Structure formats: structure tokens, C-alpha cells
Amino acid sequence: DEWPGDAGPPPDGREAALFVAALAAARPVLELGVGTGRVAFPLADLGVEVHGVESSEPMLDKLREKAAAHPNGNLVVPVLGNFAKLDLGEQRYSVVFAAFNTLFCLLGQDEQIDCMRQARELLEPGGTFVVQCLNPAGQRLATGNTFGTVELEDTAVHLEASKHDPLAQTLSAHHIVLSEGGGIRLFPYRLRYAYPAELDLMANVAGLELVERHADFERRRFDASSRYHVSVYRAAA
Amino acid sequence: EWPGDAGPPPDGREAALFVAALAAARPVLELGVGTGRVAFPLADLGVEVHGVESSEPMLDKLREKAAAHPNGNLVVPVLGNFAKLDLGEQRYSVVFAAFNTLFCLLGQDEQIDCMRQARELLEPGGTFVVQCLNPAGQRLATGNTFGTVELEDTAVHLEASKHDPLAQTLSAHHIVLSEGGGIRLFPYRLRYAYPAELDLMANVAGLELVERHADFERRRFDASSRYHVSVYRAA
Amino acid sequence: PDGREAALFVAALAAARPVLELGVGTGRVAFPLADLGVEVHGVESSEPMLDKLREKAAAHPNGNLVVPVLGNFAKLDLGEQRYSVVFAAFNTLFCLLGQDEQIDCMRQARELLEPGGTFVVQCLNPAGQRLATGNTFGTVELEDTAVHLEASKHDPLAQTLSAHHIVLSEGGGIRLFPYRLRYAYPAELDLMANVAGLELVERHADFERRRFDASSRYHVSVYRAAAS
């Protein structure tokens, strides 16, 4: 959205879109955690109908505003709510996806399994479930507390204070912005991450099976040093 | 026979006490019986141990130590790879795998199969016990490492290993260099799991966690613990 | 957050005689002690911080058990009074910025113990604190509308730590709380204790008696009059 450099959201909106589109089957897709449409609008540019779920009202409001002004806004269907509770009806989708750690916003393994399962049940035959998550091995997370520089601007610095518990597999952090004036903005967040093999087992429990894993949306080889992965799951035979 | 950290952990007695307390004058099954590191101390506690192994040789050194032991009659050696081995009607109050035995199985799938079979050999109320290295607390570098395992007056014990954080395997050689110039290499392989993955494996296998400690003396388990001792029940 | 636990620890050693807390604060140890029926004489050098204590004591259902004293750790005149326990929690002893002052402090404490009395200290453990040489910056804690950070300078020769506890708030507000320490290593500390007529009888990681080892961030050490 606004934040510059590494402080902003991952600059791969376009690539995510292409990726999902290629899996879309000219039919409609569901984005879990659609925010302000970082992936949804590029999707709309490729002629893909995107229903987007988002729990943050201020964010969804913005998506709606931008949609009104977007040449292809009409391909974007904003859905306000908590995914676990929304009744999406008889609607099925060709692709359900969750970009930039959205799945890991659910603060436990059981919640994540449940989520994968709701997504499974919304797929049409042959549909896929796609997630993009931090890859703990490649991310080399230190145990305990850390503090680091995220990005610099002429008149502000973006920093991060973080707490990592490698046993519970949680991260709790503030994104911090300090400004020349003396202003300070804190943006708290929390993740529970999964390791790839744990994640794959969760998917099985949820009735899903892994069909492919990459490091990123351009399909680069995934390996131990990959900071992220993009995983694609199908319903199990 | 290897000194300090080279040899196996010195918790054999304590393992026994922990397993014993969990058995109701009913037989217990150790996976990967050794030279009876745990088993024999169990007998000293009046507990019948059925030990599984796939090494006709090692199993033979066990038979021998069973003949010389004042309680060897309680130690029953079962030869054969656990995966393919049928124990028919016989059930157990406890089934346990000590010092990373479970992680000798080189895959999540095979590990879940082992946990399942273990569940199907538990009587009502029986428990499945594992002692595993705890990745978070073991601080394992990615890729290759080389370290000192232990020193003796006339030899050093070293370790060359490869760690693959995705497959979660450790493949290593325990190396002994001796003053005369002799060299012995002892290779070995593990696939480990994180606690939360292990608990989900246990569930898929029909088990549920009922307690976790850092060791057999029941010390508090936390992030910095090098091992955990986990106890599971049927669901 | 071990106020209670430190109190339980000290109380278990104090029997029914009075104890002396060096660096009584707003009484985060003293009051839980009173609630346990222990009489606490608390020392401090800041007449201001003593006041905040006196105010809380008046409003506490057991504040009569807390006796505020004004003086200096190393150099005090309490006269004939002796204690079953003299203690110094959360790094108090390392507030004295030198080995000599610290030894002098330990000697006073020894001279104020009755027979069988114990001197107890809680101190950061350098091995387990894994302190980098030079300057560091770190995260201490997170809240919804503020972060607690720490900036510090470490001189591994002088064994000193100079730091600011930093609080940053959504407003743009910043509070800085500076502090200084001279720490000792366990073996140094034990030898200092010997020089002061004390000997170590037990060492734990914490007031719950958890095992102390190299990775322990703190230790709780219990000293008594030296033998022979």
C-alpha cells in the first residue's frame, strides 16, 4: 500500500496473480486475507473473478473504494468477515488462496487445519488450494527477542521488534515507524508458522495432498535457503 | 563402552523407573532393545520386558547378557524389523522407544506407521513413550558441520554431519581418532520431528499426548531442552 | 515477576526472626514478605523512594512489618541489630560500581548476621547472559501501544554495563531509564565472599531452586558465615 521498500507488502502482486490465474480455469477464485487488493486487482486485470475475504473493516472499506474506481473493479467481490464463520453458500471455486502468511495468522495448528479444510470443501472437482508461507529453515529465526532494521527513508526509519518462541512456533512483533518529527507508529502482528512437513501433514488431515512447491510465485526451485514457499494442494482422491 | 558424551546417555536406571511406574504388573515392549541398557534395569524392578531388534547379532549379545544376568528371564528378545513383525494376541501396558529410536525410521510416514502399530499393541489404558532430540533446543546449523563429541587421554571423538532442514534428516559419522594413528568411522542417520509435528503424527496414529518432560526424572520441558520424553495414550 | 517467589525463598530461610533487604524498592519483595508474616528492614539511599514505600506501607494490611531504613549498603550503622537473613535481589549488589565496594557490602552483611544467618543475592550470570563486547540494542518486551527496548554499552574488562531501558509509545512519546552495573563472575563472587568471611552453601538459577548451569541467565546464591 503506502510503506516503501522492504517495509511494504511483497512486490509480487503481479506474479501471484499470474500464478493463480494459470490455475483458475476461467472460473472464480477466493482470496483469504485480501487486504486492500494487492493480489485481487492484478487478478482482475487478467479477467479473473475474485471473491475476497477480509476481517479488517477499514481495509475492506478501502478495497471497496478502489474497486469502484478500478477499470476492472467489477471482477472483485469484497466479502467482509471471519472466514471460519462466513457462509459462502453453494458457491465453489477453482482456486482458494492465501498469500503472504495469511494462513499463519490463525494462532494454532488446529485452527489452520480447520481453515485448510473449509478451503477444501469450497473447491470444485480439480480445484486447488494455494498458500504462501514463511519457510522457517531458510528464514533462520533466532530464539527469543530480536530487533532489526526493516527499511530506511529520507525522513523515517522502519524497524521491527520481535519475540520468537521456537517451541510454540509463534512470532509476535511490532513493525515500528520513527519519524523526523518525533512521531512513532507501532503495528503489532502475530504468526504461528508451520514447517513444510508439518504443514503437509496438516493438509492430509484436512483432506488435501501436495501437488507442487516453489520458492515463490515465479516457480523458482524451493530449497533449504528459500525464505518462503508457495504450495499447491488438491483434494485427496 | 565409550566415555562421557561419546557413550549412550546415563539415564538407563531413570528410564526404567519411569517406564516401571507406568506398567501394571503387565509386560512392556521396548523398541530397539540394545544390549539392554534400559531393559536390564527394568528387570531389577521386577518388570517383564519384551525387546525388539532387527540385528540377529546384537540380539545375540543380549541373549548372552540375559544368561549371565540374575534376572535375565524377564528379558525376552524379539528378532525382526518392527514394521513387518507380527506379535499376534500379545498386548502391553507400555510401549517405549528410548534415545531417538523412533527417529531411526527415515520418514514421517514410517514414523506414523510405527506409532500406529504401537497403539494397536497397547491394552486399554496402556501408554506409548518416546525419548527424542528436541530440534528447537538442539540448535542445529543448516548444512554441514564438524564438532568435538568427547576427549579421552588417548583418543578424541568427533562428528562430521550433514543436516537437511527440509527433509529433517541428520546424516553423520561418529569419528574416533586414536594416538597410534587408528581411525574408526561410525555412520548413522536420523529423521527428527518437531514436537507439534510429532503430536499431529501421534493423533493421526490414534494417540494423544498426556505429558511431556525434558527427561526421565520429569524435569520441566522447555524450548532449550535438548530432549523430550513424551507420553501418549490411545484416543 | 518473582516477587512472591523471592519472598517465599527468603521466608523459608528467615524462621521467625527479622530480615534485612538491601535496595528495598517500592517493596516488591518486602510486602509479599510481610504478607508471609516476616519482618523486613529495608535499606535505601534515596529519601524519595523510601517515601513511596512509607505510603504503601500505611495502606497495607501488614505494612507495620516493613521497616524503612536510610543508609549505605557498604557503610551502615544499625547498631546491635542482627538478622537471620540479609538479601539483595535483582542485581542490587551489582549497583555498587566496584569489586571493593561489593566486598565491603558483603562484609557488612556478614557482620549483621546472627548465628546460622544467611546472606542471599540474586545476580545476572555473565556466561548465560551471553553478553557481546561493546554496544548492543535489543527488544525487552511488547505491549499493544508501546515497546520496551534496551540500548547498552558493555565493557568486559571493567565488567560494567551501562544501559538505557527505552519505552516507545504510539504517541511518539519516549521515556529513557538509565542504569549502571558492575557484575562479577560466580568464581569471582565466591572469592569476594570468602574475603568477606562468607562461604557459598547453595546456588540456584532462580528462587524456585531450579538447577543452575552455564546457560542460566541469573543465579540465586546463598552464603553463610565461613567455617572453622
Next chain:
Amino acid sequence: EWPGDAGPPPDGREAALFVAALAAARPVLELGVGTGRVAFPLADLGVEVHGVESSEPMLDKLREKAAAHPNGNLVVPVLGNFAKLDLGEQRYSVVFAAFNTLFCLLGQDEQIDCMRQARELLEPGGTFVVQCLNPAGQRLATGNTFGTVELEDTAVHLEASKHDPLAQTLSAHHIVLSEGGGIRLFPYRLRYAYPAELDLMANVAGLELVERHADFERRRFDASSRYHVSVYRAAA
């Protein structure tokens, strides 16, 4: 201006002595004269200093301390560009850039150019002297870092930096947080060169290395020195 490690390095006098020893009672040119941390000390020694800055602002502040300094008249403020500028026929016994000034030019090319201009401003047997961070000894982490620079009773100085070890650049903010709630940010960029690269650059610019030290007191230079002071002269 600022306390301790937050302020500028405390080797002004020493840099002056070092330079004056090489200055043959003839004039010296300081690139990045700043506020005269070195120039004035040089003036105190009887040495004429022509100091160059790019920003009129800083020159003005220099012109002001000069007017209030007992030996300020020996410090000539010059406005120009390190790589390109016209000083005509004036030559110098010493041309120098202290505390990383050379690395303020953001590329190998501009650094060579500057070294060359310097060479051409030297008199016969004149020297070109630079003081630069020494990467090996500085142990710079890849990527981003955050650190404490200095403490004060009512404020803290921190540093947030981005290091690109491939472009060999450092991009930082010096940050001052105050008990008030005030925050001051002071940006800066550097492009560094390793010693072997630097000497080759000098060669390409017509200079050859004649001596290298850790500091202006001539302490031994080695892999663990955070800085070097290098002395060049025009090549055969």
C-alpha cells in the same frame, strides 16, 4: 557537537600533526573540510589549509568559526566538487580526505576521478592522504543492522543501516531519541573500497602507495584494524 562515539572521531590534533609532518610549510588541501575538525588544528600548527565542501551551508558555518578562531585566517574555504573543480595553477604539498570523505563519492568511477584530480593538484613529491574504513576489520554484516552508538543522560544515539556487500555501499540513519519524545534522523551513504581495490584505483589515477597505517599515530595496520590511513604519491 555530540558526546562520545556519537560525535566525530577524536583524532583531529593527531591528523593535523600527521599532515603537517608531510606539509613542507607549503599549503594543504582538505577535501570534506566540514567544520574544521582537522583544518583548525592545522592552523594552530602554522599550516595554510584550503578546505573544500560541496554545500555552501557548511562552508558558512566554517566561515563563522574561522572568524572566531585565533588562527582562522589560515583556513581558506573553497566551494567545489571533489572530483571536478577549477583551482587553476595552485598546487599543494598534501591533499587529504579524512574520516571516510573519499567514500562519500558513491562509486568506483567517481573515486578514481577524485584521486586523479588530487594527483594533478600535487606539487613535486607531494602526497595524497586518505583515512578510510577497512571492511575486513569492520566485520560488516550483510543486509540490515541496528545498533547502539552512544548513550547520554537524556538521549540515546542509535544507528540503522543497510549494507550491500556487492555494490559495496552502506546506507544509514544516525538516530537520536530524546527523553522529550523527540526523534532526529541523520541520513548518510558510503561506497567503500577494499585496500587491494583502492591501491589499484590509485594506480589507475597515477598514484602509488608509499605507506599505510591504522591511524594518524602510525600504529601497525592489519586485518583487524577498523580503519587505515594511506599515503600516496604520484607514480614513476
Next chain:
Amino acid sequence: WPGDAGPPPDGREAALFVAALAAARPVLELGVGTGRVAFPLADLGVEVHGVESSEPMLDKLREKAAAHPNGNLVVPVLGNFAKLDLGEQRYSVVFAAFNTLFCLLGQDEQIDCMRQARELLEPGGTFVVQCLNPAGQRLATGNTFGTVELEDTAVHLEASKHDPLAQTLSAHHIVLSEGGGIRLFPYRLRYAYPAELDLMANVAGLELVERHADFERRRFDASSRYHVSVYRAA
């Protein structure tokens, strides 16, 4: 020599890369070795002139050449990277793979080799090198000891001294084998950083035309362990 103990498995890829630039004229490989790249190039119909200073290794090449279906495309040349007289013969490509250039223990020698190389290029010709990338290799200051590779009956280890000022690596590849055997294989390199290397190239009358992480043309960045750089005559 298994896995990471052995040489890099990019022989074919190297050849393809070099072939693409070769345009039906001869190429010169500095440090031709045992033909790890030369032969794969011969399979592509490219004439290879391979240079080496070690007669021994040069002999082994000759032997594998006579037994290769395309050996006659591999012309072994005894000589010295920096200094050697090849007459009027010119090449479309002169390349040095896997750290060959860093085998010369000094910046000056390395510049001399680059210059000699430039002077053997026809018009439009190119000089290609493959070099460890210090930034991406994250080299500890001072001594280190590490595991290179494992085998069932032996371990491959490495002891090294890194001098970050001289930019040198001095190491022993160590083989320990069951039964008491020890083999030491010492080697020395002087590396250059990219920006230094490029300036070296300019001094040698060469200019950089492209840089990759490897012979497959993957993007080069700070975390790339190696780089493949292609230069033209100024």
C-alpha cells in the same frame, strides 16, 4: 570423489554457454584439467585448445582424448596462463572455469593473465571466467574447519586459513578413511571482489558485458556463491 568433494557438475552447462559464444572458431580453456569442460565442448563440435602447466595432468588428458569419439577436437597445450607464446593463433573465446583465475596468487598476476587473454581474442571475441563470489561465500576471518562430504567409508573435510586483507585462501582438503588412512590435498587461491575484478579487467583492456550466477544464466546477486562474468575487448 563423491558429491561436493568432487568438481562442480556444470561441465555440460559450461560447454553450452561457451559454445553459444564460440561461433565456429576455436576456444582456449585456461586450466583445461582432464577435459571436464573441453570434452563436453568437443561433443558440440567446438575446437578446444586446453592449457595446463602440469605435464602429468596433460598426459592423462591425451589418453582420454585418444579414447574419446571426438578427442581430435581437444588440442592440449603446455604453458603458463600469464605468460606463453601461442604465435598468431587467435580465439573466439578464452575461458577459465571454477576459480582457475584465482589460482594465480596476486592481483598483478591476475591482471597479466587477463591482458594476455585479451591479446588472444579475435574481434568481438570474449573472455569468460567463473569465480567464487566473496560476498555470497560468507568467508569467516581466520582459520576454519568444516565437513565437505560424507561417504560410507570415508569423510571429506577441509581446514583453511583465510586472510581477508591479502584476499587469500589457503587450505587442505582432508580425506579420513576407515582403517587409518589420511590424505591431505593442499591448495591456495587469491580471490577478487567483482568491483575489483572489473577494474582489473579495465586495466587489462577488457570491459564487462554480462554477469550471471552460473552457466545457466541465473540472476547474479549478493547471495550467489559464484559468478560467471563475460568480458569484451575495450
Next chain:
Amino acid sequence: EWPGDAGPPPDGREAALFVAALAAARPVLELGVGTGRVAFPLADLGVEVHGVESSEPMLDKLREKAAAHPNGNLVVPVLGNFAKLDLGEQRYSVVFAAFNTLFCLLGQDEQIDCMRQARELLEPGGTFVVQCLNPAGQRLATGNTFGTVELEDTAVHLEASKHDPLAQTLSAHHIVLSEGGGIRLFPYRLRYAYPAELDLMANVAGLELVERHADFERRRFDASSRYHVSVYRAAA
């Protein structure tokens, strides 16, 4: 006799000059004299050295180098443990322990006892000199480590060690692996003390610190110094 870093420190001569400046026409006592790395340079300055060892092997080898040395009559070898050796009426202007000798005693208590024995052997104004690793500057990892000490054409020198930071002990093997398959292990143990601890030990033994350097050439001691040379005198 071992190459580079495997061999002993090359500061024998410097150690002798430093000790001789403190000596005073009345013998010095070296604890752990080994094969004379310091005793002989000392004899070249006409200083009489009484050298203590327990290892009869090196004492037999010292005697042999001393019979073939032009000034061997100045090197008096004394066989046996220090803790047990009663040296009688003889007093010394200097007692010293180079390269970690004091840390060969495996406990704070033994070390204090040694220091005390030294104090009692000093003449009035006499001094006790020690050279010991400096923990702050050595940055010793906790637990086990393995590293390269040195390289030669046909052999590598390695080290496997166990560091206990609470007990402040190092137990290690210097390992030499040779091209033919040869393996030599050389075990050793130390218990070190931090400077402040060491000074307090000195006090307990009736000594007071009068000077501290990084080395025998009197370089400044600081956090980054790998060693220190400390000079103690008797407490008035």
C-alpha cells in the same frame, strides 16, 4: 619447534628483556621453564635463572642445552612440583610464569597458593610476573569446539576442546594429522581467571597489581587483547 601458530609464542627474547628490567643482581625464578625459551635469552643478559619443572624429560633436556650453551652456568634447573618444592633461604628479585603457566594449576585455590608461595620468595621490592590468556579478548565459545590451529605442506594442526565457562576450564587436544596417516594427540588443561578475579587472588596472596600490559613489549592492554602481562609486588 612447531610451525607458525602451532609452535610456542615467538616472544621469548621480549619476555627476557622485560623480566631483566625488573630483575636486580639477584636471581629470578621461572616457573615452568620448559626448554629455556626465556631462561637462555635471560642468561645472555647475565641474569641468573632458577627454572622449575616437574617434567623430568624437559629438565633433562634443559640440562643438555645448558651444557652446550655459552651461558648455561646461569641457568639453574630445579626438578619437581612447585607446590611441594621447599626452596629454603633463597630469595628472588623476580618470580615469573610465562604463557599460561599459572593456569596449568587447575583451581582458583591452587593458583592463590602458588601466588602466595611466590610472594614469600620475593626479596623486598621484588616482583611476580605472569602472562595469561585474557578471556574477554579470546572470545571462547561455550561447550565443545573444533578448529584449525595451523597448516603445513604435509600436516595440519587442529584442536578439539571443551570449554566450561562456570568452572573456567579448558580441556583440549592439539591434534597433528600427517600425510602418511599419522595422528599425534597432545592433551592439555587450563583453568583461567579474569583480570579482576586474578587481582583479587593476588590480594589474597599478599600481592598488589603495579602494572598490566598486552604483551612483553608493553603494548596497551584492552578488551581485545588476547593475553596480558601482569606485574605484582608485595602489599605494604
